[PDB]
Amino acid sequence: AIPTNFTISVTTEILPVSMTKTSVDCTMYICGDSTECSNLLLQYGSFCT
Amino acid sequence: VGYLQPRTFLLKYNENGTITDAVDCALDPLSETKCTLKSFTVEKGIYQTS
Amino acid sequence: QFGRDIADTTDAVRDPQTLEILDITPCSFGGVSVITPGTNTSNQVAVLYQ
Numbered sequence: 001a002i003p004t005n006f007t008i009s010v011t012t013e014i015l016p017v018s019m020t021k022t023s024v025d026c027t028m029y030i031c032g033d034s035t036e037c038s039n040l041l042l043q044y045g046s047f048c049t
Numbered sequence: 050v051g052y053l054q055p056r057t058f059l060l061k062y063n064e065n066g067t068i069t070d071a072v073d074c075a076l077d078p079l080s081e082t083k084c085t086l087k088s089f090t091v092e093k094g095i096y097q098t099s
Numbered sequence: 100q101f102g103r104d105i106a107d108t109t110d111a112v113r114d115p116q117t118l119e120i121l122d123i124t125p126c127s128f129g130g131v132s133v134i135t136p137g138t139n140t141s142n143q144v145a146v147l148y149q
């Protein structure tokens with residue numbers, strides 16, 4: 001079976017390339033503006049880094 | 050005469066046990082990045098501080 | 100007497116004298132970054148307030 005005519009077709013492909021960049025202030029999230037909580041949290045600085 | 054305040058300092062001990070240098074971690078953003086990296090030397094770049 | 104948001108923190112209060120409702124807002128906000136060419140080269144820096 002041999003084709004006798006043709007068709008020219010255009011199709012689309014969608015690909016993700018990047019995502020949102022985020023940063024966290026560890027003390028702001030855990031303690032807010034409490035000085036006492038920050039003095040207590042000074043024992044966990046390595047984990048936030 | 051000067052007056053003391055509660056501060057966080059990064060002190061340096063040499064191989065004989067004497068304090069030879071210090072960083073005041075809340076003077077400048079540069080000092081804050083020094084304090085975070087735990088080094089007295091900072092390489093070229095952009096750093097998030099606080 | 101008190102109002103609380105989704106995070107459960109208190110954000111509104113009735114004044115016990117004048118009986119008026121007041122909103123409470125934190126006063127620490129906004130991100131900061133520091134640009135350095137390297138402490139080896141120089142101590143001059145730039146600061147970006149986002």
Ligand SMILES: *[C@@H]1O[C@H](CO)[C@@H](O[C@@H]2O[C@H](CO)[C@@H](O)[C@H](O)[C@H]2NC(C)=O)[C@H](O)[C@H]1NC(C)=O
Nearest residue numbers: 001002003004005006007008009010011012013
């Ligand atoms: C090959 O296929 C094309 C269609 O893709 C044919 O062209 C059509 O021909 C009809 C009538 O024969 C017209 O009404 C259409 O408008 C034509 N299409 C276009 C895009 O011009 C073509 O005739 C076919 N060839 C053979 C030999 O079969």
Ligand SMILES: *[C@@H]1O[C@H](CO)[C@@H](O)[C@H](O)[C@H]1NC(C)=O
Nearest residue numbers: 062063064065066067068069
């Ligand atoms: C440390 O002690 C040694 C031996 O006493 C001495 O030679 C040296 O100069 C001292 N200081 C430093 C910075 O090593």
Ligand SMILES: *[C@@H]1O[C@H](CO)[C@@H](O)[C@H](O)[C@H]1NC(C)=O
Nearest residue numbers: 113114115116117118119120
């Ligand atoms: C309480 O004191 C304030 C000001 O002194 C006054 O305006 C108010 O009427 C007093 N009484 C009550 C119930 O708030």
